[PDB]
Every structure is written in structure tokens, then in C-alpha cells.
Amino acid sequence: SSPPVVDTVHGKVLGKFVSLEGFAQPVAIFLGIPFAKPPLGPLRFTPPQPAEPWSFVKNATSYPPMCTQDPKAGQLLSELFTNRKENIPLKLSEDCLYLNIYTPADLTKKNRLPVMVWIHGGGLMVGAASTYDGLALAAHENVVVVTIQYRLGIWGFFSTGDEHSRGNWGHLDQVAALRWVQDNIASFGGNPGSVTIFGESAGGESVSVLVLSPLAKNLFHRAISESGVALTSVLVKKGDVKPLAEQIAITAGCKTTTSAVMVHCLRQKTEEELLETTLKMKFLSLDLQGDPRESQPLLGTVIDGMLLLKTPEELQAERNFHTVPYMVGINKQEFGWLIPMLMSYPLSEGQLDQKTAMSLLWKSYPLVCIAKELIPEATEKYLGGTDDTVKKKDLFLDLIADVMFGVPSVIVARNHRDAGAPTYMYEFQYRPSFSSDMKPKTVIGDHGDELFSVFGAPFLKEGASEEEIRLSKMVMKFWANFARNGNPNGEGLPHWPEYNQKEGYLQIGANTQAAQKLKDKEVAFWTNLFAK
Amino acid sequence: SSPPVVDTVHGKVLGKFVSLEGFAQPVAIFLGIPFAKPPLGPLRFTPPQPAEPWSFVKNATSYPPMCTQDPKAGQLLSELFTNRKENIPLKLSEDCLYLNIYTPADLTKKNRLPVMVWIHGGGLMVGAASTYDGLALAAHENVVVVTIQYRLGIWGFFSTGDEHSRGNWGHLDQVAALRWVQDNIASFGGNPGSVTIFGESAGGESVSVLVLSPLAKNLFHRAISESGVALTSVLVKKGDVKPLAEQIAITAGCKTTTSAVMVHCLRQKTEEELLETTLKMKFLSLDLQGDPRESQPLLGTVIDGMLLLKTPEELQAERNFHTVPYMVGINKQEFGWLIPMLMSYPLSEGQLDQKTAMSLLWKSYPLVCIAKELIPEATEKYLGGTDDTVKKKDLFLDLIADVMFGVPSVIVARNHRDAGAPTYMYEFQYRPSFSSDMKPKTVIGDHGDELFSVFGAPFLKEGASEEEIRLSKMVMKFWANFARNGNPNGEGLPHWPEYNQKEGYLQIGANTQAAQKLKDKEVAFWTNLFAK
Amino acid sequence: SSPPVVDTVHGKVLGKFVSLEGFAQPVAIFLGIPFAKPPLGPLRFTPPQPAEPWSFVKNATSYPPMCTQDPKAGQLLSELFTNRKENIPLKLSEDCLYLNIYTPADLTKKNRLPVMVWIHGGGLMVGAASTYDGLALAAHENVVVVTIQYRLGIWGFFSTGDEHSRGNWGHLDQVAALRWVQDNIASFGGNPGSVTIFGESAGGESVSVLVLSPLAKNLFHRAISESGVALTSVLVKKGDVKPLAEQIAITAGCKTTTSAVMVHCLRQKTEEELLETTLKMKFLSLDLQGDPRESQPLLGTVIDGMLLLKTPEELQAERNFHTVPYMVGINKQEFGWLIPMLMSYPLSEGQLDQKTAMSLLWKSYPLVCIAKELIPEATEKYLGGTDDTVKKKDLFLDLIADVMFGVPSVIVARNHRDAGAPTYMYEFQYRPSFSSDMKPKTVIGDHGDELFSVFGAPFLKEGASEEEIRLSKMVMKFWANFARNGNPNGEGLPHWPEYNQKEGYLQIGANTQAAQKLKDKEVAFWTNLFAK
Numbered sequence A, B, C: 001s002s003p004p005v006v007d008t009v010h011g012k013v014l015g016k017f018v019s020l021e022g023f024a025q026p027v028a029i030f031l032g033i034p035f036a037k038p039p040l041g042p043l044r045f046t047p048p049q050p051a052e053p054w055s056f057v058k059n060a061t062s063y064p065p066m067c068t069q070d071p072k073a074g075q076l077l078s079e080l081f082t083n084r085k086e087n088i089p090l091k092l093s094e095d096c097l098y099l100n101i102y103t104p105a106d107l108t109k110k111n112r113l114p115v116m117v118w119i120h121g122g123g124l125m126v127g128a129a130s131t132y133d134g135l136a137l138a139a140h141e142n143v144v145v146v147t148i149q150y151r152l153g154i155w156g157f158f159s160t161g162d163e164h165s166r167g168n169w170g171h172l173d174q175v176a177a178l179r180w181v182q183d184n185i186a187s188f189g190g191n192p193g194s195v196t197i198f199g200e201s202a203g204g205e206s207v208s209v210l211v212l213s214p215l216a217k218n219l220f221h222r223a224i225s226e227s228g229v230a231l232t233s234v235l236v237k238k239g240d241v242k243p244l245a246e247q248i249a250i251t252a253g254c255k256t257t258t259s260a261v262m263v264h265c266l267r268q269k270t271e272e273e274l275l276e277t278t279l280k281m282k283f284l285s286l287d288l289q290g291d292p293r294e295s296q297p298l299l300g301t302v303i304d305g306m307l308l309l310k311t312p313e314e315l316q317a318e319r320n321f322h323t324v325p326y327m328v329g330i331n332k333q334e335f336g337w338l339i340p341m342l343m344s345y346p347l348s349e350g351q352l353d354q355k356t357a358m359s360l361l362w363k364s365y366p367l368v369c370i371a372k373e374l375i376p377e378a379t380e381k382y383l384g385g386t387d388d389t390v391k392k393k394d395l396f397l398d399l400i401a402d403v404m405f406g407v408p409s410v411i412v413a414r415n416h417r418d419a420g421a422p423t424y425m426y427e428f429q430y431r432p433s434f435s436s437d438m439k440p441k442t443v444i445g446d447h448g449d450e451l452f453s454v455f456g457a458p459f460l461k462e463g464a465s466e467e468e469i470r471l472s473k474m475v476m477k478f479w480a481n482f483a484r485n486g487n488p489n490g491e492g493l494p495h496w497p498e499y500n501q502k503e504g505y506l507q508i509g510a511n512t513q514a515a516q517k518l519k520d521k522e523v524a525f526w527t528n529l530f531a532k
């Protein structure tokens, strides 16, 4: 029939139907819907403003650009995380505040299906929404899937520490996309009364941040963090952020007389000029030559006084905030291959010794945040075993993963629980067939592996076994049920214990079964070690 | 006496008194009155905004700049259409939103004289208001004459097809200046309740557009289109305008990743950079090599969705719309010398044959928009007459004139007529003594020839025979009478029948008398041909 | 016990304590508090906009930058006027709208002490607030002292003479600071209901202008003009100013097609570019050859139609406005050494004859504004006496001093008196030990010599004698009493008569006592000569 045409507040939107195998009702897809005014010129380094309305019918049938980022790194991550057959090459632009919608609802009628907003990851430096296709999830579980984008790197996170540039522009874009949904999603057969935000990695941490922010209050009703939370140090800048702002400005060829002078100067810079600055800063690579405490991994989240009134530690410590069902999960080997490879980690010999371990762990300061006085003990706790240099390197990775995702995730889960809100945890342990060739088959539950089950990659790509297909059908149902009742459980699916005092979590993989006290031991150790 | 000082909404304006040979009543003249804020910087490619108010008295005693255009092309047209003796040298600037006023009213007393607002032509690419002196008309028929300006070329008509740059900036200016008139004319002895708009060529097509625009309603009560209407295709863009925008962005050295990207980039360019882009484009000149269907004649009117909700063809269909007295006229030989000479036509030998005719007609695509399979029938219907190559060249010029003005003008008139509103038509056939020395004396009723009678050139220049002086007097009468009563008739003047079903019109010239069915046979042929 | 933290409408401010010998209660100092939004980008050449509120605690413990100016000239004047022991070197920046506060109040309690707002001088081309340390005056007279800054030169006074750039930006900033004081001063223990503005030189003229401006109505309750008033021609521009605008524009490398075009262009220029333009104009210096009337001193105050509705002459002619106690004073030798030296006067021979003098006075047209036909007359009235060139040189200095400050000051005073408001006058006659070596010891009461006494330099620098100390205590007490009651009289002080019909004034110096009719003779004379 005639392409799908939905009416929104700003104007009519045109899309295209896409039927999936085994589903009569085709899925309506809208690509590149603007949810905010293009942040160009004077709007750079400022909160997102509403999108100007249009006079006729807007054709939303073309993938939007991805926010300015390292094009090589961007395309690489996309190819590794995409759930669709062939990766979709994208263009770069500052005009990237768009979102993609996938509704399996029959627009001719009135439907109120649950809405699931996806926040992509990429360390807040790279990524896009187009990378994730929701055609499968939307059909198999009959939910309206929405993928959003937000300013990355300098454009979405540059902060001078004061009012001239508070920061968190990227986080504000997410909040704006959430309001867009509350105001228009009903036009796509989605129930604005039931919105679930979920994201992986930096997207995960973003979810945690939104769950603690007063600005997002009432913009969602359930949240899910996949391998990433607000306690994930590397993504949250604590202390005086001024030194960073100046370092960036100097590189860009700007004076540092005052804050307003820097912001003004940086606004004058071109996109290419700021992309070059980015490349020079080398944000997603382990800095070897230099002091570990001087390596700037990124311009993560900050305490601007708007989105976040104080550090995540401080905020969660209190129990006076709108609580919602929150699902926090991690993978078996978060630091298995993906992250180390991208960051170009030194580990290439396949083995390591205490001395070298403590040497590498040190330079990993901008990631784990371990005082040089805690290096020995930390290394001993994980490598103080077998003489096998090879088995050491493996325990070294588990060492890093526990500090970045493991312990943090569990902590957030505990606090949310104590806050008196429905909490859930899981430990994904599986090795997708879509993995990379360079990835050693001895790795399972790597960073981002759960993505393929979540977005039903086995229903779009080819070569998926019946075992890999069912696993996905299970995850999608678990997720979708949560978006529906704030409870993953359902008929035909194993039992998922709510993370309470017993601290029971679900283990997903070849064999999905419940368990208890995830990393419980690991947490204890670090909680004391970190206490100096 | 002392310089006239009128009080307007945004401040007091100072002018000067000028006396015309024989008239005791001195005419108050104001030059350079702003009717909007200068469309500089971010205000480029945006609607005109109200002008900021001034403190003391503003000297409105100097000619304003003409809108940025091809300085050479603009200077030529100014010297070929000016009715004043010596041609005034103008300056270029994006700061060109001014209007000139000519009032014979006695400012010392309340006066409600009819107001005639003039809209200059020039293919929407060149032109200016200072070119036309309103002294003679204002004094002879006692009416306030107002010449207005509007953004041209890229500045006034650049459109990306969407909300990022809808377009028709130039027409919105025409509207702004009209609202200004309704708000201030009374202070100049003019009656806002009786404003007549009239223009020639592009100024004519503009009147035709305002007559059809829901925004213009109530800003004028009488319309006059001299050689140019909404059906003159060359000036109206249909279909996706996105290609033209992208071609312009590229020529200016801008990326085309998205609409917003283009507009932002172009807004960062200097006036001169856009003027160089203009010259590079080579607009008003016939392209003889390439593809006629791709040739870009100019940047005209589009369907923004604010000024025009749909194409003129569809608009004139409806009856449910406000209607006013409309006078549509054309010249004997619209494609006689002027236009061809300006666009550099291959016509130099002074004759033409059937074979070279069909070829030329095709390259003339951007003007007559005639299919390539229709060329044979069209050429045979006009040139199949005699075997005289010279007559074939003249009958070929009649071909282009009919398609660009003849047929369009009549169709527009018949629609206004059947719409239930007073309509009037005429055909000017005379050769002013103010013609160029380069125009053959055999050309009678060439494009723009009426302008000399309309603006009483015979009373400002020299060499005008009494016969020509007489023609001018009659013309200004009819006009002013039409302005006064929406009817040209008045004792002392030949009778001008209303354009009703008998399709009676007036032939102006040495011998002025009525006739019937103007271009009747012509309209039939062209409507039937295009039907295929 | 802990750094001073104060809450304001815009956010928290953090200062520092500084104790002054003789006072138990340490003074709370706040440096660099923003009272407006940085006048950058499109904000240049526009009214000051409110400052953006900050989220946490802002540290105002660092000296703010001074507005862009001649770095050399700026730093020189600061060392010559500074009352602190060591001159503080400052940075330049368009982001200069800050104010400094010195409060002797105990912020742990509720206090409401009189507020004295200082407006530094420097011909509206240079100067800073930081130059003046309020520590002494604040502690000694128990009053809150506020030092403000305002846009200088082109940035603060560029006028096209119309609505596209009225001018007086620098005066608007001063008014913007006064509003900030009324909204937040109570947080600093200040009494918003008792604000006294005072300034020296261009600061004196500013105060004088604020007294005639409707915009300053109810923003201060007492005024003090030290050596400068609104009748000091040199700082006030009369007549068409457009010619000056164009002159700057061309120098800066801009077009001059229209006013809007000129302002649009200058806004594009970088700080460094406008600064280089400043240095080129040679604003401070004096041209010895050419034509005196073709020179150009500066960009003083203009008649914008906002800040000032008409010339100070016309405005003071009316007794229709808010009348507040006004104190106007001058020094013994206004043109004794300081100004001449800074402009580089050819008086490097210490001698001057009746013929060489008539030449200088003419060349000094932009400073005295005297028709060349009058030069001979005036020159006689002063130098027509002794045949001693050495005395002629001195009498010549008295000539200029009387025309710039002497006569203007008394006239301004008398008019205020006749308006029926409290008036007072004084004449400082002392030679501060904190003078410059290169300064002749025969010069007593040079321009700005009262500043050392007013700001208590004897209590900040070293070597002051018991006499110089006593003088400073007396002056401060006099100023503080005036701020308190609008009357300088108090116990322990001589009697300062009001400026009624007897025209009594105070002779401040080593021997302070009252007198009558200040410059009465000179006032009568000049008024006559100028009557031509």
C-alpha cells in the first residue's frame, strides 16, 4: 500500500513498510526524524532547542548522519556492533540530532504499545543509531523501538566548569529525545505512558545518569543498563575540569584568558577544525609515553548543576528520588578482546608477569583509577596464583573488567535495591557467531556480545544456529516483558529472581539459569582497597 | 519652503520638495525609508523582520543601495528602463530593504490620496526601485507613488525545499513593505484603504503571486500586472528544488550533507562570495551547450507553504478566495529585442529557417519549457507561414512571447474573470523615442516599452513628440482612474471595455481603441498541444 | 576562620579576607564579579545584557581583565594612579564587565553601610578598576567600596549616529553595574538605599552624564565629580558623528556603504584587529602639523536619544528631574604635568612666547575647542602680563586647565545649585609624595593628585608623613560623610559651606579652609569670549 504517513506536532512524516519473515503486519520504519534544532553556529555548546516545524510532508526514508567523530573508529565500531547484514556507511555532520523509529503497530488503528528507546554506546566519543536495526525486536515482541543520537566528544561534552559552558550537551540531547517521544510517540502507535530506556556501554552509563537526573524525571518508566553505569569512572569526570578545557582550547589554537573567551573562540572553529583537534587529542587509545594521571581518555559526564546536582556516588546515596524498575547486567569477559583491541592495548605476547602487569596496570590509570600504592596488592590479588604467565594475562583482564563494569554495576544494583525500587541483574555469557575473525574463540561474553541477542541479529544476518536463534528469542522476550510490566518474567521463559537481599541474578547463555551474589566477593575486595 | 518632516511609527523622516514644470503644488519626496531590519548575518535566507525605531529625525534624502546583483547587468537594465533624464549610479548591498515615496498631497493637511506601489522587474535577479522616478505620475494624476525593493537572486530566493530555508524571501519583503504602507501611508497623505500594486515583468509576476497569496490579502485593493504573471513558468519552480540548492552550495564551495548544513555554510559566506557564485552561475543568459532541461535560467518563486500553499495553476482554480480589480496587460512584441539582446541569443544574421528554429526552440527549454517531441508541431504552426527567413525569425520571436506572456496572461485573466472579479486587459503597441540606439526601429511594443508612458517619461526627458506626450497622459490617466475606482474609464479617454465573456480589451498606442478575444486562437493551440 | 561566601541573585560568590593595621575586623574582598554577560560576538556594540547565573560557588579571588586598550598606555596610567604599594599588571580582553567589592562589614551579621561606587578615568580609552584598592577607604570610613569597569574606546563608544549603533555602550555598562548594586549589594553588608557614585577625570564626566540621564534615575543617591564634568567638550561629541564612524571603519578595513554595513563588518573584526585599529588612530597623542580641526581626540559620550536626550548644556538648563546632592571639585594645576606628559607636549623647553603659544593653543583645538580668531584674545588675557617666557609657559598651562576643568566645573555646579539641589565644591592643592620622579616639584595639585588622599594611599604605600596621613584621613572622612548624609560636615572637621549664592567652596590641602567664588573671574571671561 501507500507509504506510512504519520502526523506529528511539527508536521507530517513519510516512511516505508518493511515486512519481516513470519509476520503478516509489515513494520513501519521512519529514518532521520529531527527531534531538535540543528546545533550549529551559536547553538554549539548550548542546550538543544526544539525543531522548527515543516509545511508539507517530510520524507523520513534516509539514514541520518552520525555526529562528528573519528570516522575510522566510528565505522569500525559500527561494523562490530551492527545487527543487520551489511553495515550501513554513514556521513558525518554536526546536524545529527535525529532519531529512528520502528513501529509494528497498525497505524490505521489506535495502538498504545510499550516504547523502548535505545541509547548507543561508543565511550561518548563515537557511535550512531542507524547501526542498530529494530525491525526484528519490534516485530517479535510487538513494541515500538526508537533509536536516538546525541552530540559526541567536544560537541556534546566540552565543559569549562562554569556557566559559560556547563557541559553534558550530549546528555541533554538524550533528554530532549525523551520529551519528543512523550509528545509524538502516540502518533506511531506507542504508549507514552510506558517508555523504557536501554543502552549499552556509554549508552548504559547514560541510562544510569538519566536515572539519577531530575531532568529526565517522568520521561521514562523503566531502565536497563548493559555493561555500563554512572559509577563507571572513566565516563565521569570528577574534580576541576578547567585544565581539560584549556588543553583542548590551546590545541584548537584558542586563548585561555577566560572561560567565555575560550567558548567564543571554539564556536568560531569549523567542524573540520574541531575534528582535527579531536584526532590530535587521541581519546580512545592507551597513552604509554607520559604520566598516567595526565592521560585524558574523554570528556565524559560532569556535575553541571543541571542534569546532575552531584556525583553519582552522592546522589544514589540518598533515597528521595522517583524510582523505577532498573535492570543492570554485565558480560562474562567485558575486557575480553573488543575494548583492549580498539584502545590498542600493549598485551600482544599472550602472557605477562607481576612486574610487567603492575607496569601496564599503572598506565591504565585513566581507566581503572588505581593509585600506584595499590598497584602491587591489586595485581597480587588477581595474579598471585599460577606461575603460568598466560593464565596471568587472562586474570589481568578479569582484573580490569571487574573495576570498570563488574563491581560498579553490582553497587548501583544494590543501592537501587535499597532505595526500595525493583532491581534486576544478569550475567551474559555467550559467544555469538557474528564475532570478529581476529577474536580468539577462547573468549566468551565479550563487550557488546549481548547486543546480537537483544536486537535479534540472528533474524537479519545469516548462519545463525537454531541454538543461537532461540537464545535471541529468549532475550528479546525477557527484555520486552520488562518494558511491559517492569518484570522480565513470563510463561515459557526461565525464572528471573528479582535482585533483592538474596542478590539473585540470571545467567544467560547456552544454559540460562538463576544464580546468586554476582561478583559479591570481588566487590568486597575493591570496596576496601579503594578505601586506600 | 522647509524640508517636509513626516512622523512614522519608527520615527520622524525628513525629505525634500521638488517641483515639476508647470505644477504649483510641490511634490514631497522621501528616499531610502527602511521598512525592515537589514537582512545581514543570521537574518540571511530568513523572513524580513520589523525595522528598529530611531531616536531623532532621520534624513531620508539619499538614494538607497540596490540589492546585491550582477553590477553590470543591473546597471544596463537601469539605463534601459529609467524614466528620469540622467541615470542614477547605484550601490550594491544586502542592506537594501528600502522604499521610496512620492506624494503630491499637502502634508500640512489630512489627505487620503490613492496609493500606487511599484514593484520593479529583472527576472528576480537584478533591478532596483530608484530606477523609476514617481514625480511625473504623482503630480499628473495626484496619487502617492511608492517604489519598493526586495531581495534578489540567491539572497531572496534560495530554497532547500524544506523548513531549513523555505524560500520566497523576496516576496515576503514585498509583503513587508506592503504592511509598512498600511501602517504609515496616511502620514504621507495616502489612503491605506486604497492601495494599488503594480509591476512589470518579474514585478508583474510578483503582483500575480500576491493576488493569489493568502498572506497578501488585505494589503492592497487593486492589482496591475504589466508583462508577467504567475503562469510565466520561467519564474516559478516546480518539483524538487533540492538539486538547484545543492548545485549552488557546491558552486559556493559548500558541503551538501543536509539542508541545514547547506544553509549554515552559505550564511557564513561574504556578500561578495555569493556575488561571485552568482557570476559563476551565469544566470540570465541562454546556455547553448549541454542539456536544455538542466539549464538554470534563474532562482524564482517556489511553493514555500507560507506565501504559496500550492502551484498557481491549482490556486486560480478555487473560487473561495478574496478577489479585487485586476488589470493584466502585454506588449505587442514581448520577445522583440530587449530580452533576446540581454540573454545573448544566436540571432545575429537577422533571419532563421525551420531547421535552426527547432534546434533553438529546444535550447530555449528553460524559457518555454516545451517538450522535444512537441517542437516540430509548435514550429510548424508558427513558422510554416511564409518562406521568408526573416519573417520566420520574427514569427519565432512571437512564438516565445506567446508562451512566456501572451497565453499565460490571458489564461490568468479569464480565471480572475470567471472567479467573479472585475478584470481588464490591454495590448501596448508603440515605440518610445527613449528606446536604445541599438534597437531596430522596426520593433514596436518591445518588452518594457509601456513603462515610458506609465511613468510619464515625456515629462522628465527630452525629444518626446507631442503624440508621445499625449500617449503618456492617457496611460497615466487610465492607471490612476483604475487606482481610484478599480476601473480605467473616465471622460476624455477612449472607452475601455471590461474583460468579461466578450473578452474585450484595449489596444494602447497611436490609435487607442477596443477589440476582442486577445490571443484567443493562440491560447487554444497552446493549451491543446501541452495537453498531450 | 574560613573564606567569605556570599549568596547573590545569580549564585554564590567566594572572596578572601584582608586585615588592615588598626582594625580588628578584617575586610572581605571580592575580585572579578561579573555584572553583565560578556559583550562578545553579536553582543558587541549593543546594550549590556544580564549575567548568566552559575550553579555552584564562584571564586572571585582573582583580578579580572581590563577592557581592550592600549596595553602600554593602560599600564602606565595604572602605575601613576594606583594607590597600592605594588602596581598589579593586568590582562586585556573584551570580556571585561566585572566589578570588585571591598566590605568592612561583618558578613556573619546584618549590616547596611553606605555604598561608594567608583568609576575610574582614562579619557574613555584606557583604565581599569583593579588599579584602585578600596581596602583603606572601606576599613577607615566603614563603607562598602565597589570598583567597576566599562567598555572603552571603540568597544564602548563607537557611534554611527543612528539606531544601527547609537553609542554610549560604556555608559550603559556603568548603569548596568548600578542596577547590579541595587539588586545584590545587601548581600555584602551594603545599604542599597544609600549609593554614592564618584569618579575622577573621564570617571568624573561619566558621573556627570549619569546625573543628567533618565536611565540612572534612582540608581544612586549622591554624586561626586573629581576633575571632569559633562561640559568638558573633549569627552562629548556634538554634531554629525557619522564622519568619525566611517573614518574608523576604513582604518579597520571595512566597507562604508551604510551604517548597518559598517557595524556588521566591525562586529566581524577580531579583538586584535580592533586593537590595531585603535593604535593606528593615535587617539591619545596630539598632532603637531596639518589641521587641528581635522584631528580626532577620542570617541566620547554622544547624544543617543536613550542615555542623553539632548546636550548637557540643554539638559542642565532645566530643573525637571530627580535632584541629588552633587559634589564637584578640581585641582590647582589640572594641566600641570600629567596630561601634557601623556599627550607629549612640545613644552620640552620650559619656556613659551606669545607667538609659539598661539600656535600650540590652535594645535590643541581638540582639547580646548577655541576658534582661531579667538586665540589671540584669550592668549593675551593670560600671557599678556609678564614678558617672562617661563611664566607664560605656566600661565599657558593654567589656560588649558581652566578651559577643560575650571570653568566647566563651576558652571555645572552653579546650574545644579539653581536647580535647587545640595551642591558643594572644592579645590585640591597638595603634592603627594607618591608622585613620579620625572615630575617637577614646582607642580602642586596636578591631575589626579587627590586620588592618593581619597583612597588612603598613605595607609597602603610607604613613607607618607604624618601630614599626608592626616590629609588622607580628612578627605576620606569628608567623602564618607557626604555618602552618608549628602553633607561632608562632621565632628573633627573644618566647616565645608554649601554652594549657595555666596558660592563658598573648600580649599583642601596642607592648610584646609573655606573660601568663596571659585574661578569666578575666569568663568565670566570665558563665557564672554565664547559668546562669539
Ligand SMILES: CC(=O)N[C@H]1[C@H]([C@H](O)[C@H](O)CO)O[C@@](O)(C(=O)O)C[C@@H]1O
Pocket: A031, A032, A033, A057, A058, A059, A060, A061, A062, A063, A064, B162, B258, B259
Ligand atoms: C539525504 C536525503 O535524502 N535527504 C532527504 C531529507 C532527509 O530525509 C531528512 O533530512 C532526514 O534524513 O528530507 C527528505 O527526505 C524529505 O523530508 O522529504 C528529502 C531528502 O531527500
Ligand SMILES: CC(=O)N[C@H]1[C@H]([C@H](O)[C@H](O)CO)O[C@@](O)(C(=O)O)C[C@@H]1O
Pocket: B031, B032, B033, B057, B058, B059, B060, B061, B062, B063, B064, B065, B098, C256, C257, C258, C259
Ligand atoms: C551612506 C549614507 O550617507 N547614509 C545616509 C543614511 C541614508 O538616508 C539611509 O541609510 C538610507 O539610505 O541616513 C542619513 O541620510 C540620515 O538619516 O541622516 C544620513 C546619510 O546621508
Ligand SMILES: CC(=O)N[C@H]1[C@H]([C@H](O)[C@H](O)CO)O[C@@](O)(C(=O)O)C[C@@H]1O
Pocket: A256, A257, A258, A259, C031, C032, C033, C058, C059, C060, C061, C062, C063, C064, C065, C098
Ligand atoms: C583565567 C582566570 O584567571 N580566571 C579564573 C576565574 C576568575 O577568578 C573569575 O572569573 C573572576 O575574574 O575563576 C577562577 O578563578 C575560579 O572560579 O576558580 C578560575 C579561572 O582561572
Ligand SMILES: CN1[C@@H]2CC[C@H]1C[C@H](OC(=O)[C@H](O)c1ccccc1)C2
Pocket: A336, A337, A340, A341, A347, A348, A349, A350, A351, A393, A438, A439, A440
Ligand atoms: C588481534 N590479536 C593480535 C593478533 C591476533 C589476536 C591475538 C593477539 O593478542 C594477544 O596475545 C593478547 O595478549 C590478547 C588480546 C585480547 C584477548 C586475548 C589475548 C594479538
Ligand SMILES: CN1[C@@H]2CC[C@H]1C[C@H](OC(=O)[C@H](O)c1ccccc1)C2
Pocket: B336, B337, B340, B345, B347, B348, B349, B350, B351, B394, B438, B440, B443
Ligand atoms: C544589432 N542587431 C544585430 C545586427 C543588426 C541588429 C538586428 C539583428 O537582430 C536579431 O537577430 C534579433 O533577434 C532581433 C531583434 C529585434 C527585432 C528582430 C530581430 C542582429
Ligand SMILES: CN1[C@@H]2CC[C@H]1C[C@H](OC(=O)[C@H](O)c1ccccc1)C2
Pocket: C336, C337, C338, C340, C341, C342, C344, C345, C346, C347, C348, C349, C350, C397, C440
Ligand atoms: C623633563 N621636563 C623638562 C625639564 C624638566 C621637566 C619640566 C619642563 O617642562 C614643563 O614644565 C612642561 O610644562 C611639560 C611639557 C611636557 C610634559 C610634561 C611637562 C621641561
Ligand SMILES: *[C@@H]1O[C@H](CO)[C@@H](O)[C@H](O)[C@H]1NC(C)=O
Pocket: A003, A014, A059, B240
Ligand atoms: C518522498 O516520498 C514520496 C513517496 O515515496 C515520493 O513521491 C517523493 O518523490 C519523495 N520525495 C523525495 C525525498 O524526493
Ligand SMILES: *[C@@H]1O[C@H](CO)[C@@H](O)[C@H](O)[C@H]1NC(C)=O
Pocket: A161, A239, A240, A241, C058, C059
Ligand atoms: C574555587 O577555588 C578553590 C580554592 O579557593 C579551588 O580549589 C577550586 O578549584 C575553585 N573552583 C573551581 C573548580 O573553579
Ligand SMILES: *[C@H]1O[C@H](CO)[C@@H](O)[C@H](O)[C@H]1NC(C)=O
Pocket: B059, C240, C242
Ligand atoms: C542630513 O541632513 C541634515 C539636515 O541639515 C543634517 O543635519 C545631516 O547631518 C545630514 N546627514 C548627512 C550625514 O549628510
Ligand SMILES: [F-]
Pocket: A121, A122, A123, A124, A200, A201, A202, A203
Ligand atoms: F561506550
Ligand SMILES: [F-]
Pocket: B121, B122, B123, B124, B200, B201, B202, B203
Ligand atoms: F523581470
Ligand SMILES: [F-]
Pocket: C121, C122, C123, C124, C200, C201, C202, C203
Ligand atoms: F580620563
